[PDB]
Amino acid sequence: SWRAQAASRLLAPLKLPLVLSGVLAALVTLAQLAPFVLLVELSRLLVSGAGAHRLFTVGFAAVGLLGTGALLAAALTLWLHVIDARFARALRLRLLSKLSRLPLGWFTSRGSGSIKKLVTDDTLALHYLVTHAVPDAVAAVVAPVGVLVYLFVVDWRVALVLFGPVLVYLTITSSLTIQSGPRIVQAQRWAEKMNGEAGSYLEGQPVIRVFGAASSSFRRRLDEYIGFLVAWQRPLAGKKTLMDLATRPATFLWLIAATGTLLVATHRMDPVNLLPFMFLGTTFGARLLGIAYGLGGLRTGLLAARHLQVTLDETELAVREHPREPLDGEAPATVVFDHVTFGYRPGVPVIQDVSLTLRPGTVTALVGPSGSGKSTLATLLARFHDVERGAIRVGGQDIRSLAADELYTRVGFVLQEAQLVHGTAAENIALAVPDAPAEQVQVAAREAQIHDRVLRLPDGYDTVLGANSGLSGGERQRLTIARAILGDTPVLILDEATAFADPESEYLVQQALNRLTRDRTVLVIAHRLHTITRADQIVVLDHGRIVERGTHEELLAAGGRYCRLWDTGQG
Amino acid sequence: TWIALVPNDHRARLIGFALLAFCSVVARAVGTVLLVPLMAALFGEAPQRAWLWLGWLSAATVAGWVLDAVTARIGIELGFAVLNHTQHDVADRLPVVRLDWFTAENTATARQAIAATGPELVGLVVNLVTPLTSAILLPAVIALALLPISWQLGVAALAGVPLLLGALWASAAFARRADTAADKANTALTERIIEFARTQQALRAARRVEPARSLVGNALASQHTATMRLLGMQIPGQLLFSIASQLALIVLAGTTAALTITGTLTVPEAIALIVVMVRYLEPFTAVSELAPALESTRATLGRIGSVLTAPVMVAGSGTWRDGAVVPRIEFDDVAFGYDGGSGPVLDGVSFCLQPGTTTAIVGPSGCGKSTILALIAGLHQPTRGRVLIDGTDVATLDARAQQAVCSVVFQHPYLFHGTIRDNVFAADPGASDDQFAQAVRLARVDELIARLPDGANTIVGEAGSALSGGERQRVSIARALLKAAPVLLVDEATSALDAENEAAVVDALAADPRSRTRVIVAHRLASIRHADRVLFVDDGRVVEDGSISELLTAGGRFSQFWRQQHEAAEWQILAE
């Protein structure tokens, strides 16, 4: 509401230049509206003897005023557009440098539209707020105060008389804003649900063309929508009409005419002192209403800044904590673990106290009923998030005491995303080691079964991997797997849900995985029992609380949840 | 070509409202012109004469009051009518729009067309039409009525007004151009950052985030563009109309003072003429104020017009009675490529499916297999071929009798917000409980309809109870199995997790006691096991034909695919 809620916190530097531009805008507005005072003076000059040169001096003053007003406005807009760019540049730089510290889970949380929305929309809205919304607001604020003071200093009768229509407008507005009490939020809810239904209707177009009886839902929703708006706006008609009528420059003219006629005809005041009201003071009504719009113009920029600062105040990864001597009993492999209880969004804990151990060179299967916090346990190992209690240690060194290079030189993950970078295909096959002597690339691609599909390309190894490259899923999943075979990281996280995408081109992906997992510690996130039923050991779990671990037959004949899971009638 | 053709004809409130608006403008005009003689009594030797003209001005302003009230009421009524008409039009027009017009952002535009025009179209006539047009014409009629009393003054304003109009127009255009230049530059700048954020997971894992960051950082910091010509093209957008008005003020005041100094008119009313010029210069300021609302209305109306101007499909004069029994199909080199460049293309597919069999379309990835189903149904148009189901041509047939032959199962399921009973009944508004019962039993969904809390009435819509994959797919299978249309073309939903879904597909395909022509783009060998004639398709053109067993003797490109599917179903993940 007040001085500091993250918004002035973001806008720390823009105070001194902002008040400078504000006082300059007030000055240039007074320079805009002084010509009417000059006109009043010339009018007085006309009724006592004109002469040759006095009016010419007046006109010279007027043209000088015009020139200096234009010069001042130009100076102001130039200074604003100057002061904006430096702040925009610093903001973008700080935003990037913060973007390259966030935990990986944040990106998967946000998505794809969120990032673009945030960056582009908020930077552009902030620029607009700085360059347009502030000067227009301060001008629309200062102008009525000035004209009111000038109208009071020339006469206190007519201004007090003129105040009436303002009272009328205010009371009518306040009486109006009692009938649309809940109607406003109800209409907002209608709007958002209609947006949802519109999105649904559009995304499901083809079905509509075949079964033409599925548009009745959207049709009746649209009918009810328009009926709601119609029934809403019908009452407020006369009230809005009166609200408008008692502002217009017509009624002001008659009011001023009547008051001035009553004053002058009885010799209560000279007639030349009525010129200010015939001049500016008849548009005063419609001028006052502009204040509301000028102030409301700030809302968008304020919300933008709030959102952006809330984002930028995100917490980064943990500190590279106290380095302690490793190897109590462990090896390069053997990724122990201990009472993790990750949780995330506190209230609800998604995992619970687990304590397992991958052998030096054996496989491990994370079977479990889908949705019961099964993949998150694996992603947490690649420092997608930080544990709140307990310690993982690849070997002996807890992942906290490991730089972002010593970590991703011992842990290589393969997940449900592609993540291709914009470059030549040879670079995407050699992102791990940036300089492969153009034959290791070829052997690591002929071991991932992607040699033919990259040879028969438009330009082969050098076609830029654009968004319209002409590729698919398993055709580039093999590209990323070829990239991963060069890394040679002796710990692998293998999301098994990638072997059955585009079920046409999956034999090659299976061969790639076969010759990718050769004597290195794996951890498979299982989705089918028959493919994993022979790895080394099977771990069952339902939202934490590892139910049972051990080998296949052990899990099979114990009466276990494994036995109640592998009996879907053998399917 | 209709940009914003809202009203049907109605002619009546239209002409009446136009005439009323013109008379309401004349009201303020005569108000000011009748103010003209008033001041001549104040700054004079007789200050008592003013009362008569005060009364006349009171009559003028009460007339103005009545007129504005009635025009505002008619305006809100016309706003209601235009809202109704335009939204009904857009809704009823969306379905016939060409199918391939929906891109990833064109869809967003269309979504905005019918989600953000409620409050910005009802309050349109009473906020943009009447004020702007009432303020444009007013200066002209003021000058006109000023002519017969002071022709030296009248002609000055009558010649000045087009200059001020042009100044307003040019200022608005300059502001718009500056804004477009600015936002385009900003987007071109931030594109690099938008890109660097999406590959944030492949970079860190490839232990190369620091150089990849430093590069874009250096580039962005270095580039400046100096913004200077941008400021120079921005400034006139701000300061042009203020200068025009400020100059017109001096011009008019000077001509009035000059006419006073010679002795044509007299002092007591030259002041009245000055006041009248000041009154005449205000509508220009009002129009200058009504810039941003105008721009936003232009934006929204542009959305709506863009939607209302999309290309359409064409169908004419179809002849159907049943299909007679069950249609046979035919192709001729259909060649559908969406531009000739990037796309399915289908350079030379030509076959013939006899009247009623099962037929699978196997083949390597590359969705010619789905555009074939699209062409068969009706959704797309072959750019140079002729699908001739049974003996006619589908392209030269009527729209009403076009979506009345095929019944499609879709690879990506879709259920609209409502009870699942309504979703399944979204194919036949009749369909007594015998049809619905046999349909709900054929597709294995009676299980879902029996283990439901309230039963057959759950509101699935978005974020269903569980309804993940298999369930929605079985609902879609049942719905497409309801329709009587005598050709069923199935699309194998990508879900190799549900043995129930597999058996549902096999049952719907081979156990229906009806008789229809079946086509199933399948990859699960369990499905293509029953298809008695398969079509292999690579790079458009059909590469192989014949029964299953026969192709396993030829030994070409199908024996390999069969032996590759018999192996990628038991791939164990042992490590040795």
Numbering used by the authors:
A (entry chain A): 276 to 846
B (entry chain B): 4 to 579
Authors' text:
The heterodimeric complex IrtAB has been identified as being responsible for the import of the two iron-loaded siderophores (Fe3+-MBT and Fe3+-cMBT) from the periplasmic space into the cytoplasm of Mtb and other mycobacteria. This protein complex is vital for the replication and viability of Mtb in macrophages, which reside in the lung alveoli. Like other ABC transporters, IrtAB contains two transmembrane domains (TMDs) and two nucleotide-binding domains (NBDs), with a single TMD and a single NBD in each of IrtA and IrtB. Interestingly, although IrtAB functions as an ABC importer, it adopts the canonical fold of type IV ABC exporters, which are normally responsible for the efflux of intracellular substrates such as the multidrug resistance protein, Sav1866.
Full-length Mtb IrtAB was overexpressed in Mycobacterium smegmatis (M. smegmatis) (strain mc2 155), purified in lauryl maltose neopentyl glycol (LMNG) and exchanged into digitonin detergent. Two-dimensional (2D) class averages of full-length IrtAB cryo-EM particle images showed clear features with the SID of IrtA clearly visible in some 2D class orientations. However, there was no SID observed in the final 3D reconstruction of the unliganded protein. The cryo-EM structure of full-length IrtAB without a bound nucleotide resembles the canonical fold of type IV ABC exporters, but its TM region has a partially collapsed inward-facing configuration. The two polypeptide chains of IrtAB are asymmetric (RMSD of 4.37 Å after superimposition of 336 Cα atoms) in this state, with the largest difference located in the TMDs of IrtA and IrtB with an RMSD of 7.15 Å for 139 aligned Cα atoms, especially in the TMHs 4–6. The overall fold of Mtb IrtAB is similar to that of the crystal structure of the SID-truncated counterpart from Mycobacterium thermoresistibile (RMSD of 2.38 Å after superimposition of 1,021 Cα atoms). Furthermore, in the cryo-EM map, a strong continuous non-protein density was found at the interface of IrtA and IrtB at the periplasmic side. Specifically, this is between TMH2 in IrtA and TMH5 in IrtB. This density appears to belong to a partially ordered lipid molecule, implying that such molecules may be involved in stabilizing the complex. In the absence of ATP, IrtAB adopts an open-inward conformation, in which, due to TMH6 of IrtB protruding into the central cavity in the TM region, IrtAB represents a low-affinity binding pocket to guarantee unidirectional transport.
